[PDB]
Amino acid sequence: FKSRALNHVKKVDDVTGEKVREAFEQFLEDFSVQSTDTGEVEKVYRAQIEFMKIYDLNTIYIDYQHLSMRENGALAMAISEQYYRFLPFLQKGLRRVVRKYAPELLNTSSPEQTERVFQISFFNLPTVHRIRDIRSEKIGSLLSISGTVTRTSEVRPELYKASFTCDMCRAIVDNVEQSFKYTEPTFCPNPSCENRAFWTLNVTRSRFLDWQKVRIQENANEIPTGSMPRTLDVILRGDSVERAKPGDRCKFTGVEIVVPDVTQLGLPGVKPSLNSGVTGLRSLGVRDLTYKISFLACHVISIGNERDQEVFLNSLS
Amino acid sequence: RKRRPQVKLTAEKLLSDKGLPYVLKNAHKRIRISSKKNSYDNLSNIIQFYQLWAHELFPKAKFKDFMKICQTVGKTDPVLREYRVSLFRDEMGM
Amino acid sequence: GPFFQDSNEEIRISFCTNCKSKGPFRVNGEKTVYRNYQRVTLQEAPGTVPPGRLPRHREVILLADLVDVSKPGEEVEVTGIYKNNYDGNLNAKNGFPVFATIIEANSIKRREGNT
Amino acid sequence: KFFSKESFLADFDDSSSNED
Amino acid sequence: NAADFSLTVLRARIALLATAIGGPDYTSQIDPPPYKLGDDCLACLKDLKRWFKLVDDQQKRWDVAMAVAEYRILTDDLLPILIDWENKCSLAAKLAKNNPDHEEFRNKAYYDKIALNCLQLLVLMTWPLIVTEQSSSNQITLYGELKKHQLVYKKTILSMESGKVLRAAIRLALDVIKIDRLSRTPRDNMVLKLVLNFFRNVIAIEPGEFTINTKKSMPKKGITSIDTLPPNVSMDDISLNTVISSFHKNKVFGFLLTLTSSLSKEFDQDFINIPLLEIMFYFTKDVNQELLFPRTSAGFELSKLLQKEHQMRKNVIKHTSARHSRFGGLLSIQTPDKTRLTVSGSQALVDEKIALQKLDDSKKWNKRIIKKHQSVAAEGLPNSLLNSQTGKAIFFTESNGKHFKEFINNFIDSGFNILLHSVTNYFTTEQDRMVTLEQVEYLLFFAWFVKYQLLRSKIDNSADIKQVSEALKEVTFILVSSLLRSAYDLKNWTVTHAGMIAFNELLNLVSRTKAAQETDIEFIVSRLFSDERIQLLSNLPKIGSKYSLQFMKSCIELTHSVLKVLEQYSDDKTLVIEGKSRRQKKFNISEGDITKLIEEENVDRDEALDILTSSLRSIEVNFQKVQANYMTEPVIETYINFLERFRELEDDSIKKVFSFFHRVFVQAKEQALLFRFDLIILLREMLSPDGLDRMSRSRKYVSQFSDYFLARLKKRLKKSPAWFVGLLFPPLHNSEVGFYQRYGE
Amino acid sequence: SEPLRIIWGTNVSIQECTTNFRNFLMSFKYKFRKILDEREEFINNTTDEELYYIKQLNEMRELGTSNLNLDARNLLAYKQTEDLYHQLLNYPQEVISIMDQTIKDCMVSLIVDNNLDYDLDEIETKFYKVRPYNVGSCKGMRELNPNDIDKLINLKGLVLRSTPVIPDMKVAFFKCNVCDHTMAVEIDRGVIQEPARCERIDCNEPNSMSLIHNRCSFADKQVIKLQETPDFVPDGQTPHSISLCVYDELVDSCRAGDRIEVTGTFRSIPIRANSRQRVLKSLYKTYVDVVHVK
Ligand SMILES: [Zn+2]
Ligand SMILES: [Zn+2]
Ligand SMILES: [Zn+2]
């Protein structure tokens, strides 16, 4: 048998990403701007990390005004212009700071122990956008949208990190990432085996995340004369599921994303399914691909019991 | 079943009217290297005439691939070698 | 060889035990075992939901004795294994790698009275 | 710049004692 | 059904043994459960050693390793035992230091024996996995999954309360060290070798490689990922930053320093000379020395990177159409030979160059480019500078980078010389028996620490270059030159690359010591350039173009160092060199001449006969001959092939390439070597806005060389039109016309 | 000797067109239009001596916008672009690109000519597009014929409904799976120029390409169902509807229910009969690709 070896050390790194990672981790470990009591070094994000360490949370609340104050607005502009490129580097910097300060926080927390899926939320943007103001020139960018939710979906599991087994030699391929369609590995890592299809999913080993798709429309204050309201799908993942109830005036801050037609990508078990889009792809064959504007929100606010003495005095100021 | 041979850069192809005699006829007329122009424009003017000559001669290959197959044919074909020494001998005879 | 059915998705036959390729497959009558199967649409109770909101639907598998125990309109407490399976229609109509959820019921208790 | 082994034992025992 | 039955009974027996080693003591009520040893548990450690001996070693199987790994013996049994022993021994040492002969261990010998056996299993189970040819199919099937389990092992070792097992291992070492040198049995020094081997296993574990089967054709989906990582293990846990943090917190660095600095006076050096070098190599295989000296600052470099990205994005969107995709624009271009060629675009409507780049890019036929298929990974070797990309950067933090800088500085200032002398003592007798791994790690250790001391002496004047003065002995010269020569004659190319790096840094060190002081320097430059080594360094670039990018970059740096160290002797003429004589050099000796030489240089006549013989092979070389030997066409071919990757490289490598192009095209004055068309296409690509940045300092000398190049090109084509053919083809070899082709008569 | 470029099937030079429009936009003052609109008897010369377009282009670099409203009757005014006016009635999609590249080159020449201290990055980053209006007589939706295919027309109508914004790719972003090389390719007429391998020679792995959907750069496309105005309809039939495709800045420039005079090219595309097949029906979908909205 003949085998070809591929190394992970050959991969080209994009140095702007790890410089963003260094700037973000220095922003976490060196912010120290608070007016609580006297003017003192506080490092409020480190205190928030110990707050997670006490209360076993998994999401971080970061104000965007702090990012604008740190390094003349340049780091905030670098995050806001290309959030999708720097998001693994943002997660790596958060993981490095948590490893430096709270080493037990990296695990989920008892034999089963998985990597904690840290979710980064950036709130308090300087401007808010309307659904009518959404353009496709600013996808992958940090945007805030005010709207009213029409209906909300079931809290369903996404396949976040996937593990598969080869049906021939029972080899294990894990950390397969599914962007928008359910994907299986192509090349069997055993050099003796030559399997290409027929991979069986490992339900237990794979790591899942919560999913919710809420559909929003613009508020009646900004609806002009004689127009049907334009709609937008907003994705809530992780801790932010079931936070927004339908019919409320609410602000989502997060990422504008674009989603492809999944049926046109050749999903297993689904027949290929009116506006002409792009084509000329190998996965498309002769078919065309359509695109829809959606949103990937990272933080939600809504702008529209315990009958015992001890818990009420604990909850009191 | 032998149906067709796929075409490559051959000795009869360089010795046609559209080929290296075209280069000897029109390269000194077409190529202009000037000190007033910057080096990008000069180098692109060098590339442009040879790229049009390549797209008239052997349009199947890309231009860097065309230079690679010219290197291979110049290392291989003997008729091209005696033509190349014949050009030099004819110009030093005059 | 005989393979056990998980009552979520059909057993994927990639090859055969003698030939390493797909072929014609039909059920032999040498060893066949049949069990009862019934899906119920378990809607959330309207006194349990928040007032004015929408109910939630999860398909629940009833096997063996559990068939015909539930009735349409009967309020129940189902104690069951909460599994998930891959379907292509949810990924088709949602745009994200989303998995359907299936409750395999181990037991049904009638919720008689206020309890 | 010679590094003494007895200094490493002393530093090991001292950083066992208080660790600074 | 024998194989799966044997596998399941083996897995059952390893499961029973793993339950029989110990338990977390759930009976006692402590908020952290203290680990309690099982009854008759040392016999279980000997049974794991017996299982790893009888099955894994002679029978050529790796089933026992995964049978251990899936039941978490290292994660849940050996590490809590060693950490409990470490904590108990530390508390007992504190209480015995404050008051001696109070609160002893009950069974300290038993605890020391089980700790030693646990460390033996750590070394035996985290051994580096090499799969060469003719190995068993079980190892070939199991190699990737066992590498993943070793990655889990490295993460669990470095992450379990910041690696207290490292403190346990150094405590097991200082159990040996406290004994006097005369009273130490060889078993105690073997325990020291066990500890040093454990540290080399902790450092040396790297992510595996993704191997595919190429018998079947590659489908349209292709390779979707090459990730070879376990679920809980990330790239941050494996990386060197956590290694430096866990080593500095647990004082591994001081342990390595105090064994390196007193290697000859305190320890038997033959036991631990090789694992110490392996440890130093496994630090320094993936660290670039220029990035260790950094010269808001992160935001400063970030702002410059966004400015560079903004300029490149502006140059990209110059080509981008202003309208949408369906806005159809068709353009018909004509040559002065009347023809119509149609292109589709909006930006290509106005300018000719974008339209011609479209017409070049519209073709769907691609030439074959043959690949070496990276056969270095077939040998058992770690990923290093010989395998990593030139643009790969290790991202040290501030504290980790400062601790690594302090450790390397104290290593060079304390015991680089003693360790290097001991290793070149050992390898000069074991030269014909060492496999490629020790040759590669010796040459890389030597080259890395010589280069780091050179860079530190260049940056700061406080450091002394004489701290790597034992690099300049004749024994290391002989060893490095013989390793490079034996690598070349056997056509081994990894050791050739490592020796090329080592020889380049050797020449750089010689040049630095010569520039510092102006002597033994003429003796050593006569020593290195003796024999047929000038022909070796001459024909190394001729064979460079076939191999990888890193080999070709080392060819650049080695040839630049050779020409820089040999251009210093152009006027001084001191080029006496021991040469190889071919035919008869026999001379009838005269004993009167011998005795007057005895009176002259105070010598015995046997070594005067040696001097009289060695004077006969002494020759002199011409530096113009060295240049003219270096000017062969495959050397220009490999340098043009190296300049093709101009996006990835920094300014220094292309500065070296254009300096050699100035050496060819201005100084040597033969210009037909650079009158080839691939250089013209590459110069168009570099001088385009899509290529080199205008703010970069490289484009200045690229533009100057291209200006002088096109000036001489227009001179040659104005004097002779026949060279219009000569740009296309390789240069001609016929002697009747080749003088006119190369020089113009 | 110079390989000049010709608009396809037209025998019209690129260089003649792009010099005629350039010298036009440098040297068109409004008094020549006042001559050739028969408004000589109502001249206001103090608004006529100055350059009509150079002042507007100096205003665009200060306001920050990058869209030039232009009327085509001035092409009848200035002589050198007179035949170019017929190009606007004959071959719109080429010459419109020629005008917007000439506009961007005029910003470049105006910055570098008077030595005004302005950064070239902000000039070259923005995309300039021409917006021609008032090109000719208003045409009816009934009188539209297949002789108007690939021509520039005006329409008068009302908006029935407005779709949400449709993404259209402008640069496709591709990534190698074995070496993480991130490269960019150009979309042309809806087909992706997909590479078979990396541009890097070091890996050059075939079939390793992946499309990163969210890192591609996009543009806007909105389809408007234009309805014929009730003043000019025949008495027998309902007003007809046409597809009206706006792009980029002109998306959401048209509200609902308002009367608009729209300017655009009249194009016909083949509709695809089956979703997974290449078979195209004989009937063609007609849409007005919009270059200006009034
Ligand atoms: Zn397999
Ligand atoms: Zn079969
Ligand atoms: Zn690649």
XYZ file of N, CA, C and O and ligand atoms in Angstrom, chain F residues 176 178-179 181 198 200 203-205 208, ligand 3:
41
model
N -7.731 26.859 1.575
C -7.191 25.509 1.499
C -7.368 24.807 2.836
O -7.218 25.416 3.897
N -5.611 22.036 3.837
C -4.391 21.420 4.348
C -3.301 22.435 4.655
O -2.305 22.068 5.299
N -3.445 23.690 4.222
C -2.412 24.686 4.465
C -2.940 26.054 4.874
O -2.124 26.946 5.124
N -4.337 28.511 3.219
C -4.103 29.652 2.347
C -5.437 30.281 1.977
O -6.316 29.616 1.424
N -4.312 25.041 -4.822
C -3.822 26.306 -4.297
C -2.904 27.003 -5.291
O -2.328 26.391 -6.195
N -0.325 28.344 -3.947
C 0.944 28.034 -3.306
C 1.557 26.790 -3.933
O 0.880 25.775 -4.120
N 2.280 23.250 -1.068
C 1.392 22.100 -0.928
C 0.885 21.661 -2.296
O 1.128 20.523 -2.713
N 0.202 22.577 -3.000
C -0.396 22.356 -4.323
C -1.341 21.156 -4.316
O -1.391 20.373 -5.266
N -2.084 21.010 -3.226
C -2.929 19.842 -3.033
C -4.179 19.966 -3.892
O -4.894 20.969 -3.782
N -8.559 20.442 -2.486
C -8.573 20.851 -1.088
C -9.371 22.123 -0.861
O -9.377 22.641 0.260
Zn -2.928 24.700 0.196
